[PDB]
Each structure stands twice: as C-alpha cells, then as structure tokens.
Amino acid sequence: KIVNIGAVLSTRKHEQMFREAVNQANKRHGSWKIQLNATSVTHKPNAIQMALSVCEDLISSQVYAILVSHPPTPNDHFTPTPVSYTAGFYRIPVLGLTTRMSIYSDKSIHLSFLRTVPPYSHQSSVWFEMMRVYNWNHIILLVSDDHEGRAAQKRLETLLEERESKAEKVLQFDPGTKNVTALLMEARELEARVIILSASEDDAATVYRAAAMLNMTGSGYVWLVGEREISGNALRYAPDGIIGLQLINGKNESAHISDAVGVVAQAVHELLEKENITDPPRGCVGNTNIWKTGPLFKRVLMSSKYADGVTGRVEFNEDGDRKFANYSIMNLQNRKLVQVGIYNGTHVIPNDRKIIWPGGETEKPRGYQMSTRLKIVTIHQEPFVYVKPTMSDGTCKEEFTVNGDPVKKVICTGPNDTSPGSPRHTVPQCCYGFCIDLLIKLARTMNFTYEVHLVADGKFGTQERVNNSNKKEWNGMMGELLSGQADMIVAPLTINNERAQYIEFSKPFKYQGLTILVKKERITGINDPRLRNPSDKFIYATVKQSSVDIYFRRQVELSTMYRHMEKHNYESAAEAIQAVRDNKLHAFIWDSAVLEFEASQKCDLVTTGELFFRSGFGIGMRKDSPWKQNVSLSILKSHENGFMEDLDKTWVR
Template sequence: FLGVHLVNGTNEVNHIKDAVEVIGQAFTRLLAKESISNPPTECKDTDSWYHGDKVYEALIETKLNGETGQVSFSQEGDRLNPMYEIININSNQRAMSVGLFGDKDKVLGLRMMVTNLTWPGNVFVKPKGEKISRDLRIVTLKEKPFVEITRLPKDGQCRPIHPAVHAFPCKNGTQDYCCMGYCMDMLAKIAEKVQFNFTIHLSKDGMFGTFEKHNGSEKKYWNGMMGELMSKEVDLIVAPLTINPERAKDIDFTKPFKYQGLNILVKKNQKDSSLGSFLQPFQDTLWILVGLSVHVVALVLYLLDRFSPFGRFKLAKSDDAEEDALNLSSAMWFSWGVLLNSGIGEGTPRSFSARVLGMVWAGFAMIIVASYTANLAAFLVLDRPEAHISGIDDPRLRNPNEKFKYATVKGSAVEMYFKNQVELSTMYRNMEKQKQYLTAEAAIEDIRKGELQAFIWDSPRLEYEAAHDCDLTTAGDLFGRSGLGIGLQKNSPWTHEVSMAVLDMHESGFMEQLDNRWIRVDSRSSCPESNSAPATLGLTNMAGVFMMVAGGIVAGVLLIFIEIAYKRHRGLKEKELELARNAADRWRGNIEKRRTLRQTLQKQREELKKPNSVSKQPSPSSMHATTPTTNANSLMVNLESNNTKPISPFYRRPSLLEATTNSDCLPPPLPMGYQPPGYVPARSGRTVTWHNPSHNPDHLV
C-alpha cells in the first residue's frame, strides 16, 4: 500500500508561524500604499468590505521561506510547491516514509527508495509489471444514429459528410466499411483527450450481448459484443450499450455519455379512404339483408296486387288497365325507388293489401336512409385516426389481441428489462410468442409495412426515426430510464481516463452538440400538419361512389347488348310462330273446302238418284265442270256410296281420289282441248290416280 502525506502537515506551530508571517508582510505592503477601512463587524451585515479584494491580492502575492518550507499561493489561494512524503505500509503494518514528491528548484520530481518498498504479497522484489498498449481494439455495431456504416470507397479513404463529422474505416469480417455517427464523433474526441490509437470492427453476430447457455452446455456465456469483450478480443465497446446490473457484474462502464429511456414507436394512422368507404356505415350482413329485403318486398307486392280482387289484374280488361298493371318489373322498380327516395311515376300497387306493405316499406326505407346518412357523416367527415398508444400501461400492450403485435430486439438490454420486471413479465411472454427481431432496422421496417404495430426500443433511436419519417411517431412517456456507456474490460486501466474524458465533454457542451447534430434533426418541416378540425370530403372519400356509377354505366351498356340479342332471338321465334299460324290457317281452309266438297258431292248423288236425271248423260265438259278443282294443297275425297250409277262410259268405280306433291308428274299427252271424263286437272307437283275402263284399272298419271 502506498500513500502520500504533506511534509510538516501535522506541525501546527510552524504553520501558524508561517501564516502570521504572510499576513504581516501583506498588510505592511498594503498600508504603505494606502489606508484601509475597517471591515464589517456585525454578523448581520451584508455589505462587502471595500478593501477586501485588495487585502486578498496582497496575501496571495506574498512569498517567503518559512518554517514549513517555501510558501507561495496560486490565484485561487492554494499553496504552491508543496512537498509530500511517500508512505508505504510494510509487513508489520507500520507506515514508513520511502520517498518525497514535490517541487525542487521549480521542477516537479519524485524521489523514492524502491529497495525499501514492500510490494503486494509482502514481497520486496519489484514485479515485472505489464506494459499498457495505446493501440486499442474497438468493437461496434450498426445502430442509427449512433453508428452508421457505408461501403468503403475504392481508394480506401473514408470521406465524412460534413467537416465536423468523423468517419473511420471498420471491418465486418472481410468486408470494409466506413463508420460514422454519434459514437464515432465521440470516439474521436476521447482518443484526442486520452491519447490512444484505435482500430474498429463490427460485431460478428450483430448483437449487443446476452448471458445465456450455448450449444446445450449448462454454463452460461455472453454473446455479441459482450462476448468479444469478455474473451479479451477487444478493449472497448463504443456503441449505444445500455448500462444495467447484469452487464456491470462482468465489465466496466464509463460514466454515461447519454441518459435515455425506453419508448414505443408506432405508425401514424392514416385517414386514407378505400373505394368501399361509403359502405362503412353498415356491416356486410346488414347490406346483404337490405338488398335481400328489396327483392322480397318487390315479389310480395307483385303477388298481393296480382291475386287481390282489387288489383289491376282483376279489373275489366282494357288497354289502360293492362298498361298500368303492377308486373314484377314494375314492383322491383317501385321497391328500389322507395328505398332510394326517387320519384315513382308508374307501376304503383292498387290493392289495399299491397299499399299497406308499400307504406311499411317506405317507413323502413326512411329509417335505413337516415341511419346511413348519420353514420356516413361520422365515418367520412368526423372520422379521426385511432388514438395512438398512450404508453407502456396501454391495454393494447397489456392484453393484446391476435392482430396487435409488438416486439423488441432479441438479446438486447430492453428484452432483459422486460424479463426482469415482474409487472412486465406478461408482455415479455407475449413478445416471445411473436416474430423475433435481431436488429432494430428489421423491426422498424415492419412498422412501416404495417406488419408490426409497436416497437419498444431506446428513445434516442426512436426519436431519430420519427424525425426522419413523417409516417412514424413515438407514443407515451419514457419509462425504464437508464444510461448509455462505453464498455471496457473488468479493471481496465483505461476506465478512469475515458470516464474523465466523457465528463469533460459533458461539461464543455460537446455532447449537446452531438445530440443536435445526430439525434435532434428536425426533418418534419415537409410533413403535413395534423389538424383536428373536421376534414373536407375529397375524391379519395367518395371514389367508391364514382366507381359505382361507372359500374352502373358499364352494366347498362352490357344489358343493352343482351336486350338486342334477346330481341333478335325473339323475332326469329315470332317469325316461326307466324309461319306456323299461317300453315294452320291454310290447313283449316283446306278442311273447310273438303267439307264443302263433300256437301257438293252429296247433293250430286241426291240429284242422280232422281228418275228424271238418269237418262241424262252429262257431256265431258259438264262432267268436268261438276268435278271440283283442288288447290295447291293436298286433297282427299272419300266416295262413300257404292250404288251410284255411272254418268258416262268412263265413269270410275268408287275409289279414293288422292293428290300428292310431285313436280316430276305431268298429265298424259292428249288432243288439244280434250279432257277425258273423270279427269281432274292437276297442277304442277300433283299426281292423280283415276280409273278408266279403256285403260289399265289403275293408271298413274
């Protein structure tokens, strides 16, 4: 053990002698120049002594060789050139003077008898000691705004973005980068004050460090930057490393270079309206029921008016009644018209039962439309984004639903904070079930995409992100306050010097400059201002309505083509039906003609049965005249009587006269103007079978 002791520090008599001598010489010189007023003597006096400053200056200017050695003072009144003796505690626990330290001939010096020292372990041999290298190895990791990395240019020179910004080469395995940021500027200042050189490399696994088991072993180890420092691969951790009790057990921390807390980063809720925003006032189920009700009411109105004895269908048949009758199409038009509050010019129900239903439907439509209008105003005009998270005690964090996800970085001090806090253990278990993030960049990117609803992290980083992105903001107050420090090996000889450099930078305002340069960057001037006043409706709010109108136009155009195609198809059917009706009319005409033929033949038979008509033999021309001529259609005549006497030698026996269509059949060549008895003129396309005694019984013409 070594200590120092002021020489003659315990000799009060000599110190009093020197003090009186200093006062005497000071007043002697002062009174020789001017008179001195009396100082205030009352305890309650608040006025300063007019000559007090002059007395003080005279005292500190006094110099003498006194009983305690050379006596002189600094401007602050401290004694200069003191002499200290070096005290060593020996093996017998006795204090021994082994040297002197002080000014001699205005030179600060140390005179020590090393051979008389008792070293630790009660040994008298001087230990070899350890040489302290001033080339330090530093590890860091990418964490905006504290450390930002860029690719190293081809010329191998890191160029800072600003003259006040420092950029240093750093390695990540075999890749070369340039590191800059808050911590790099701070490191440059510390190296300047403490006088050391350094090399930088990035963390191997990109983690701060957690104390956990590895490879199935029972023993726990530190990973990340903490593991590299514990294994003495590096000398310092210069990064936003949170000071906590778990880490402080195994490494040394400097004084905090920044005080911070935890905060929550969320994405601002935008008021972007979707195309279906005009449908928001009602749920999907209600919209389906309203649409179904329209068609059901239209069908019931049609049926009531159709079967009611007072409906138009039961009125006397007239053109007006038929035109005003409530058909299904008119009922549908009426139902939609009442719901949409449009004028109904025609097709209204006539029966009392249908009108009662119409009044009830009108009341239903009034309530639906009024409710829709009120809710539409609330959704489109007064609708505000959902309130941000109020803080760490927000119910959405304490009892989240399946759609609300929040997280922090795995293996970080924030995760350890939630793990060790009993009241936050539920949140820690919820975060364990969610997606695990190894870096803050990945979590912040998911916040932007909307895949993560809240990210809990150090406030400086979140403030930086919120300042650079108008869509992000921090929610609630800070919690879990802590400090960020530089990590060193346990009992490192650099701990005190680096800590003193950090404190000096705080006192000089250098840290405040770094905050303004890297963290408190105001980039929100281009962000739109939030306004709590009701928003004016724009195209984004009503785009769905215009899309609906466009859809109606397209539907109308498609339906007109369908109607045209249907009309053409229906016209062809009507032509076919018209031809069928014409054929049926011709058939009925033929039936009437056959009936007339039978009646005519019947009359001829009756006339032939008379006695005075037997001797009369009709001439061929008369025979031909009495034979009915067929038309272009098929003709069949059944001669029912077998007792008819022949009217000429060529009279055919009772048979079936049949005409069929055949364009190849022509009558036999006969003399000009000659027509044999029993001949029936056949037009083109007909065959006639008839009987002639002078020819074959069945001669086909």
C-alpha cells in the first residue's frame, strides 16, 4: 500500500522543497512500509484549465490529500477555489498554506478544506483582547460590505455578545467606491474614540486619506487595523500612530510545507490503525461517488496535535482552521513599522518599546470624548416636574417658597402646539420642581452644562413592535435616549429589568412603589377578587407605555389584568387622575410617590392597599455610559448629607 499525497504550487522551486520535506517525513515514522509518495503540479492561468489539471495528475493518481499554496502576488480567493471544489467533490482533504480569505471557512461551500494559517476574520479576536487590556468599550466597526467585512463583523459581534457589551455602530463601506466621507462624518459625532477598520488595500488607503481630510487622526483617537491595512497602498497614506498587526510567518512557504506534511503523515499513521481504508477515486472520469474513507480521514486530521512543527504547535478548531497563532503588533512610528508586542494566543505580551498613539501622546488615551453640552429629556410629572408657560419675554413668573426661598427654574422646550394630533410646534416653557433641583445640583457637582427638553409623545416608554414589521422598537424617553436625541433622562423613571437591558440606571434617588387610587377604601392591593375578576362594575386603568404596563405585560399570572387594562389606558397621569376624580374611572394604578402626593394635595381621593411593586426612580443613561459612577456617587452623597430630605420637604410636603 503506497499512500500518495499531492501539492499544487507556483514557483517551480518550492516543489523541490516539498519533495525534500516529504522525503524527510518518510525517513521518520512508526511504519516505513506505507512508502509515503508525493506528487506536484504548477499553477495554471485559466481557472477551468486549472481544475482540469487537478482532475488529471493529482486526482488521476492515488492521492490521499492535496496541498495548495498562493503565488506571492496578491490574487485573493481565485487560485485555490478550483482545486478545493474538485477535491471536495470526492471529500479529499485540501490543506491551504497561504490563503487568508474567510470564504474557505464556510463548510457548506468548501466541504473538505483545512488550513494551517488563520484567516483575516480571526484578527478580530486579538482586538477583543486589546479591548480587554486597555478597558476600551466604545468602538466603531468600519468594515467593508464584501464577505470579508461581514465575516469579521460577525465574529467580533459574537465575541462581544459572549461578554456583556455591544459595538457602538458599524459602517458598511462598499468596496471600490469613492467618497467614504459620509461615514466618517457620521462617526465623528459619536462618543466613541476607537476606530476599527477591516478593508482591502485600496479601501484602507481611501479611508485613510478621507480621515486625514476630516482631521479624525488627531489626539484621543485610536486606530486598530489588520494585515491588509498596513501593507501595499495602505501603508503609504496610513496615518502615524495606528496599531496594526501581522502574522509571524505569513508567507514562509517552506515552513508551512514542512509543518503540513508532518501533520498529514501523523494523521495517516494515526488512522491507519483502524484500517478500513478505501482507495481514492483514481481519476475524475469513471467515478461519481465520494471516497468513503475521506470524511473519516478529514475528521481525524482535524484533531491532530502536531506539536513539533516549524511554526509551533498545530491544532485545528471545529471549522478546520489553525487554532492558535502569533500576531506581531505593529505601530507606525515616524513612517516606520515598529513591533511592540506579540500575541501568544490568549494574551498580548508587551516586552519592549512604547506605543506611540496617533496624536503623539505617550500616555494611553481613554476611548471616549464625552461632551460638555448635554441634552437632557424630561416628562411632566406634577410632584417632580412642574411645567409652566413662559411670559412673552422668554422667562416665566418669578416665585418663592412659603419659607421664603427662591425657586430655581430652567428653560425647557415642550410639545406646546395649537395644532391637534401630534405635537407640531416645540414652544418653550419653564420647568422646575424636584427633578430639576436634583439636576441643578448634579450639574453643579459634576461640572457640565445642560439643555432640558420635554419628551415628544408624553410617554415614559416601552418597547413595542414597529408597524409594518416584526421587530420591537422603543418609544418615549426610552426611545429618545437609545436613539441619541437625549443624552440623559432626569425624570421619575422606574427601574425595571426590561429597561436595564438597554439603559444604564444610576443608584435610586427615590424609593417608592405601586399603589391604587380611588375616590374617597374597599380595595386591598392587586389581590382583591374584584381586580382578579374583571367586569364593567369595577373599571381600572393605568398610563399607556409606562412601567406598570410592562409590569403587567411581563406577568403570566396577571394576563387577564393586562387584558382588561388594555381597553381603558390613558394618555397621561394627570388626565387619569382628573377622570378618576370626576367619577369616570374607578381605580387608577400608579406610583406611590405621585399618587400619595396627589391624594395629600388635592384630597377627595384615597390610596388603598400596600405597595405591591417596590422600586426606585433612577437617572437613565445610554448603555455603559462613562460617567455613570460619578452620578451614582453624587446621588449617594445627596442621600447622606441632607439634600434628599430638603428636596422632600420643599416639594412633596
């Protein structure tokens, strides 16, 4: 039994190296009777003629495995495709030595394909590690629209989703298209200062020139790119201080040939014990069935720890890709590509030199540039946020407390519009109260300026399925905070699990619960049989798109509760209270903090039962906002000294 392997090369000289390497491999092994044989063929220009060349010689001979290399001149995924298809027809394993494209990782297209070199997509992994090293969280994924960009983005998103994080935004750059300036203009607005690029040489050069035009290469920014973006045309126009990376061996054909023949021989020896070896198809013509042993040969070849190779230990993952690697990190320091570290496979190891960031700084920059002018959204809640009309001169009535203290007021832009339906005019008013006083204290403590505006639709916000679609989208202050119109929510927003997945909540600044308001006392909580057996006799309702809606919708035990509620929800809390007092609605379920104040001030109404959902009000921010801790600390401090007691006494008597 003579086990023959084959190779398709280009240089006509590396085939002699492959013959030498296979001869050495034959000189060392368990058995020496298999008489390992080798054959080789040079590359052909025509792809169809190339595939026919694979069918002849290689396939015609009794070959067990095929190796394929790539000519030095970059031609991308064009040369190994025909041999991969032809050998995958018979499930004959094909080992790639220099190709880097991720299209060959898809086992649906290329069935029997393994590679000894990681693809371009795997680079994203090291980026994650770097993001762990420097604690960067806000990133932008500027990736091409081709398969490579989609694969890199998908892998990075998978890694990020394994952890608790998410990329700020991705930007699809269509290959070969000029004017990428729109994407850079969009990315300049965002808070993230870490730019990640995945594109070819021409695309990388184009985006580098466009970013130089937009001055996005200055101080504070961080650029992380791949191998294709620090070579060829890209390196010429690349801005200084970018951090790229490159594989250690990369193009050392001889190392990848020796390391491949060693593992192939080890695999052959390993599976030869079980025998049941089926001879190869012996020619494309005269056979239409796959080689039966082929699948098992590939399966045993994938799990083969050949830890004596030129390029280190060889191991393959579930998709037939070389598990580990070593990436050298490159910095463009004064037009020179200097090495500053080596990625062992799980952690980057910095040994010598110092990273020079693009702005010229010698100190690690944080990955965000939080602005000073802060847009803050708020809603109209009577005990917390009083909204009053401003006089014709642009400021509203001056007022003082009963004790004799000046009431601080700010200017806000609310939905006041004479036109019916939606708000069609944002006429300014003046806002004050508990939340605005807290906001003023917070802004004084944290040294930032603010612009306060009211929510567009008068709702707190729950995610709901968008019309003519199947996905759910947020609305209200929730939607405006997530979209970007507002940067912080200072309002009585109830903390709950649904909102905490997308919004970051500070420490609660007001503990409260949910209670029931009726006319001025035969209701005990939400467990009374009348409230468990809905009917026209006792009607109960809440505010649409609020925390109570979410609470009842997320309860399996209270489905009928929400079913009855859905028929009578109200636009706002104030109109619901007015309807209840006027004997148009029987019971109104709402927060204790507001309901108790309404019952105390306006009287003629009573709160019944004990609080059945204890929660707190919190300042809402975008996910992973850098200044969450600040605010939380301040809130805790306000609880400690005297501030929340004074705010309670002054506003909610």
